Every structure is written in structure tokens, then in C-alpha cells.
Amino acid sequence: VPWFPRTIQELDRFANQILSYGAELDADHPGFKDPVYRARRKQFADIAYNYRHGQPIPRVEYMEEEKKTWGTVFKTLKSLYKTHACYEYNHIFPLLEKYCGFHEDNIPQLEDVSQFLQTCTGFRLRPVAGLLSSRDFLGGLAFRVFHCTQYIRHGSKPMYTPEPDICHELLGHVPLFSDRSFAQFSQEIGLASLGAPDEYIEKLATIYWFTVEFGLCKQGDSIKAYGAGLLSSFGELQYCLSEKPKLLPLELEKTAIQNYTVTEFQPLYYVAESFNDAKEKVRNFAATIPRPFSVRYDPYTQRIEVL
Amino acid sequence: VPWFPRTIQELDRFANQILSYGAELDADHPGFKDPVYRARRKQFADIAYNYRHGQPIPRVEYMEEEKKTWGTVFKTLKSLYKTHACYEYNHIFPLLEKYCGFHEDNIPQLEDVSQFLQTCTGFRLRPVAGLLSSRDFLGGLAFRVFHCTQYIRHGSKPMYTPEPDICHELLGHVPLFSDRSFAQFSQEIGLASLGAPDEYIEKLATIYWFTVEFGLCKQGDSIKAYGAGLLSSFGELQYCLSEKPKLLPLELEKTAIQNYTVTEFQPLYYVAESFNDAKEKVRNFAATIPRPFSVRYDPYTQRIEVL
Numbered sequence: 001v002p003w004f005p006r007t008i009q010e011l012d013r014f015a016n017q018i019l020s021y022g023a024e025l026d027a028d029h030p031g032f033k034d035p036v037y038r039a040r041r042k043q044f045a046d047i048a049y050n051y052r053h054g055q056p057i058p059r060v061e062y063m064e065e066e067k068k069t070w071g072t073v074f075k076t077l078k079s080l081y082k083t084h085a086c087y088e089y090n091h092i093f094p095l096l097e098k099y100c101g102f103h104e105d106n107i108p109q110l111e112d113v114s115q116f117l118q119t120c121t122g123f124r125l126r127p128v129a130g131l132l133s134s135r136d137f138l139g140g141l142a143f144r145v146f147h148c149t150q151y152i153r154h155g156s157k158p159m160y161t162p163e164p165d166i167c168h169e170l171l172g173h174v175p176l177f178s179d180r181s182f183a184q185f186s187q188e189i190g191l192a193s194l195g196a197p198d199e200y201i202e203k204l205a206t207i208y209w210f211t212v213e214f215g216l217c218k219q220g221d222s223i224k225a226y227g228a229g230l231l232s233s234f235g236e237l238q239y240c241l242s243e244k245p246k247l248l249p250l251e252l253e254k255t256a257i258q259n260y261t262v263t264e265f266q267p268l269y270y271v272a273e274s275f276n277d278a279k280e281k282v283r284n285f286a287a288t289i290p291r292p293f294s295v296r297y298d299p300y301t302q303r304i305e306v307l
Numbered sequence: 308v309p310w311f312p313r314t315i316q317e318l319d320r321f322a323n324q325i326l327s328y329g330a331e332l333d334a335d336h337p338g339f340k341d342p343v344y345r346a347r348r349k350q351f352a353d354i355a356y357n358y359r360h361g362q363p364i365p366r367v368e369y370m371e372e373e374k375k376t377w378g379t380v381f382k383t384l385k386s387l388y389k390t391h392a393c394y395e396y397n398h399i400f401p402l403l404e405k406y407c408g409f410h411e412d413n414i415p416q417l418e419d420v421s422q423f424l425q426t427c428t429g430f431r432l433r434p435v436a437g438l439l440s441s442r443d444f445l446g447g448l449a450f451r452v453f454h455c456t457q458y459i460r461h462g463s464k465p466m467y468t469p470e471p472d473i474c475h476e477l478l479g480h481v482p483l484f485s486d487r488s489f490a491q492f493s494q495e496i497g498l499a500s501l502g503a504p505d506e507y508i509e510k511l512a513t514i515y516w517f518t519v520e521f522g523l524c525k526q527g528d529s530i531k532a533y534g535a536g537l538l539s540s541f542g543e544l545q546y547c548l549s550e551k552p553k554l555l556p557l558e559l560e561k562t563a564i565q566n567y568t569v570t571e572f573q574p575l576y577y578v579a580e581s582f583n584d585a586k587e588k589v590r591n592f593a594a595t596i597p598r599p600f601s602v603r604y605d606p607y608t609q610r611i612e613v614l
């Protein structure tokens with residue numbers, strides 16, 4: 001059985017198991033030829049490298065150029081949320097603006113955002129430099145821990161990123177973690193992953209793609225976006241609620257094996273009835289994963305109980 | 308409906324609702340004529356007065372005379388535990404000795420004990436000076452918070468205390484809070500209390516007396532003590548497992564209205580089948596309390612959810 005963390009501090013092992021040779025090193029990265037941007041990325045990676053559970057997340061002073069990039073992404077996306085984002089998103093966004101400094105001329109600091117999520121649902125952030133394995137990323141969710149980038153995309157192409165950057169995490173992921181039902185749903189995926197065989201990890205990663213990253217949900221008689229990758233994509237957020245894509249009900253035996261690509265708009269989305277119903281479905285799917293034990297998180301001690 | 312705290316920080320209101328004119332002010336208190344002891348008690352009360360949730364509990368340097376008193380109580384009680392105390396007590400006591408400094412020549416500091424309980428079950432301590440109302444004391448349990456004295460009894464009568472002192476809390480109460488089932492059981496009493504009418508508070512206080520304070524429990528085919536007031540009383544701990552007292556099964560419609568006195572050994576004890584069974588019984592009893600809502604603690608946000 002694969003090793004998995006049993007205490008929240010044990011997530012500290014992940015930082016020495018990331019992909020070391022990251023996207024910003026590629027010839028086609030928007031910032032590839034910018035040595036200043038290169039050094040900035042390395043500085044953020046070093047903060048995540050040295051971070052340890054329990055510490056406050058170091059604050060960073062963002063440059064004017066970084067704030068400009070943030071403000072372009074923020075103001076162009078914000079125009080779609082009232083109409084395209086789910087209720088839970090719009091409900092919390094004004095509080096993020098009031099208490100977390102979410103505004104076009106200011107990049108929120110992860111420590112503030114983390115304390116805010118803690119008050120809402122117990123979720124917390126940890127800074128992460130580069131790409132975690134699916135197993136390690138998902139396992140953090142068991143503890144209501146979200147590994148979060150601190151860096152920003154290159155300012156030459158503000159509307160484009162080949163990777164999660166701080167605009168994706170804060171405008172795409174964070175608002176849903178403020179919701180109890182969504183937090184329980186995403187934690188359920190994390191719990192399903194612990195000690196699961198690699199073959200089932202890939203399936204959970206695919207369910208994750210079609211829910212947390214690109215999911216749509218029913219809302220009264222309508223349909224709204226909740227996936228992080230939709231909420232942080234101006235073009236795909238408008239497309240996903242148009243007549244063009246195909247929609248199917250969330251059905252995890254099907255969703256789990258569905259292929260997808262990361263470089264175009266999704267041709268197909270799965271619709272969740274609700275976050276509670278998705279959570280039930282994940283729980284049922286997880287019972288089908290060959291594991292010689294069952295797992296439960298204890299938030300009082302921040303430990304996983306293994307039976 | 309009576310006000311009750313809804314967040315763990317809100318327990319801070321209790322400190323300005325205690326009995327201000329305490330037992331040490333009475334002519335028959337063992338330390339009454341000792342002005343040094345008087346000032347020492349006032350110093351501990353001022354620490355509890357100024358304490359605020361979230362802070363570390365101030366450490367105190369205990370005098371040699373205080374440590375002597377502790378060591379007499381500690382060594383005389385410790386001789387009974389292997390035979391008279393429940394398994395959960397004996398299981399945790401060596402770890403308290405190893406990691407909390409529980410030894411005859413050292414009074415443990417509440418901050419260390421609190422961090423230890425947190426790792427075990429989420430329970431924490433808050434220092435308390437004097438007598439809380441039953442409503443406020445019980446309400447803290449809803450949050451897995453135990454209000455704990457820091458002072459010690461007068462050294463003139465080491466085997467006697469007319470009040471809870473630090474020897475009672477640490478040797479009587481603390482070890483049971485290290486057990487998950489016991490923690491869930493005592494929290495259930497706290498939850499039952501929130502917004503309950505005074506008439507039901509008195510009933511819950513009486514159940515508390517006959518369980519947390521003076522309860523006995525079945526253990527395999529035997530019976531053992533778990534009540535704090537037994538575990539910190541050399542004479543009553545031996546008596547309670549002798550032929551002299553009457554024993555009855557824990558039955559809360561009966562137990563809740565049973566009278567008792569605080570100045571002699573109890574003539575009657577109630578036997579719990581287990582802490583889980585006691586917890587179930589408290590939950591059922593609580594549904595009988597007229598409250599126009601139901602309550603649940605969320606350990607992720609440390610808030611009470613009221614429906």
C-alpha cells in the first residue's frame with residue numbers, strides 16, 4: 001500500500017517530491033526570455049520549499065507590473081461572475097473583497113486568504129512552487145489543505161497562462177473553498193485517494209478535472225459554473241454556458257474514465273446535481289477502490305484515523 | 308432563550324460572570340489565616356481574569372511548599388490507580404508522566420497539559436479563578452474546553468480540599484479528557500446545555516455529578532472508577548469499589564433527579580456500561596429538553612451551528 005500522510009504536519013514531505021524542472025523553463029513559456037521573471041519564479045519556489053506546516057505564509061511585496069497583470073485578469077473576469085458563476089461563488093466574493101483585499105489594484109496575500117478560509121470551513125492554504133503528483137495534491141485535500149501557487153503569470157500575456165498561477169488559485173479555486181458543502185465534497189476526493197492504487201488515483205484525478213476544475217452544477221432550474229478552470233478563464237467561462245458544448249449528468253463510472261485535453265475548451269462537461277450529491281457519489285465510488293482499510297479525518301486532532 | 312456562546316472565542320464572556328467572593332475567604336478554609344496564601348490565590352485569579360482565548364496559558368513558578376503539597380497528593384493517590392481506575396486512565400497516565408511532567412516533585416504547567424490534550428482529542432484548558440455557573444461551565448464542554456484551576460490547596464491539609472484545586476483537575480479530570488469516547492461523552496453534555504432552560508441545566512449538572520464527577524463504569528466483567536472526584540480522593544476511591552455503597556445502572560430519567568451531598572462519601576453511584584453508551588443516553592435525554600432549535604459543534608471553524 002502506498003504511503004500516505006496520517007497527520008497534517010506530514011504534508012511537509014510533499015515539498016521534496018515536486019517536479020523540479022518547471023514550465024517557466026520551457027522555450028514557449030511567455031516569460032522564458034525574461035531573466036528577471038525567471039529569478040522571481042525561483043524566489044517564490046524558495047518560499048514554498050522552506051515553508052513548514054504551522055508557519056504563517058510569508059507575505060510578498062508584489063511589483064507594480066505584477067499588480068497590473070492581476071488587475072487586468074481580475075477586472076475582465078469579474079464582469080462574468082454575477083451571470084455565469086454559481087451562487088456560492090457570488091455569495092462569498094464581496095466578503096473576499098472586503099476582508100481579503102480582492103481588488104484590481106492589489107494582489108491578496110495567501111496568509112490573509114488562508115485565515116479567511118479557515119474561518120469559513122477549516123480549509124487552509126500551503127504555498128507550492130511547482131507540480132505535485134496527483135496523489136500528493138489530492139491527499140492534501142483530505143486534511144482540507146489546498147496547495148496554492150504564489151507566483152503570477154508573465155505580464156506580456158495577461159489573459160493567458162499555461163499553468164496555475166495566483167490569479168487561477170484566487171479567482172478560480174478559493175471562493176468555492178469558502179463553502180461548507182463544497183469543502184466536504186473536495187475533502188471526500190482527498191479521502192478516497194489516501195493509499196489508493198495509482199490506477200485509482202488517475203481515476204480520481206479525472207473526476208477532479210470534471211468537477212473541481214471544469215464542473216457545472218444545477219442551480220434552481222438553471223446551470224452555473226463552479227470549476228476553477230472555468231472561473232479563471234474568460235473565454236471558456238462564457239463558452240461553457242453556451243449551446244456549443246455537450247453536457248452530461250455527473251456519473252462517476254463514466255466520468256472517471258473520460259478522456260480530456262488541457263489545451264482547448266472542453267467539448268464536454270459533467271453537470272453535478274449539487275455538491276452534496278457529488279460528495280455522495282464520490283463516497284460510493286471510493287468504496288469501490290481496493291483498499292484494505294477505511295479512512296476518516298479527525299479535525300479535532302488533525303489526524304487521519306485508519307481502520 | 309438564554310444566551311449561549313456560538314464561537315469558541317465567545318467563552319471569554321464567562322470570566323466576567325464568576326462568583327467573586329470565593330471559598331478561600333471563609334473562616335473555615337484551611338488557608339484562611341494565611342495572608343501569603345491569600346495573595347497567592349489572588350494572583351492565580353488575576354491570571355484567569357486576564358486570560359483570553361487563543362493565548363498560551365501563563366506559566367507559573369510554584370513554590371517549594373506548593374510542590375510538596377502536590378507530591379503528597381500525587382504519591383498517595385498514584386498507589387490506587389492501577390487497581391481502582393479505569394483502563395483509559397491507566398493507559399494515558401504514563402504518557403502524562405513522560406510528556407507533561409506529572410511527577411511528585413513537579414507541578415505540571417497548564418499550557419503543556421493543554422497542548423497534550425489537544426493532540427489527544429481536541430480538548431483544551433482555560434484557567435479559571437473561581438466558581439462558574441453550571442450553565443457556563445457545561446457550555447465550555449460543547450467546545451471541548453475545560454475550565455481548569457491553577458491554584459493549589461493550602462499545604463496545612465494536603466489530603467483535604469473544600470474545592471477543586473490543581474491536584475483535582477490534573478489527577479482527576481485531565482486523564483479522562485485524553486480519551487476520545489470520554490471526550491465525546493462530556494461534549495454531549497455541553498451540547499445539551501446550550502440554551503437549555505435553568506431547570507434542565509440543573510438536571511444536566513446532576514447527570515454530570517453522577518458521571519464525570521462520581522461515575523463508575525463497567526470494564527470487561529469488572530467495575531472501575533472514572534469520576535474526577537473519585538480519582539482525586541484517596542478515601543473515596545477505595546470506598547467506591549468496596550461493598551459499602553449502593554450501585555445502580557446509569558438511567559438518566561432517574562439519575563437526573565437524584566439528590567446528593569458534597570460533604571461525605573456518596574452513598575450511591577451510577578454505573579455506566581461504557582462512555583459511548585452514556586453518550587447515547589445523554590443525546591436521548593437532550594432531545595427531551597425544550598429547545599426551539601438543535602445544535603452541533605463544527606470543529607473545523609470552532610463554531611456552534613444552530614438550526
Ligand SMILES: [Fe+2]
Binds near residue numbers: 172213
Ligand atoms: Fe486549479
Ligand SMILES: [Fe+2]
Binds near residue numbers: 471475479535
Ligand atoms: Fe471536578
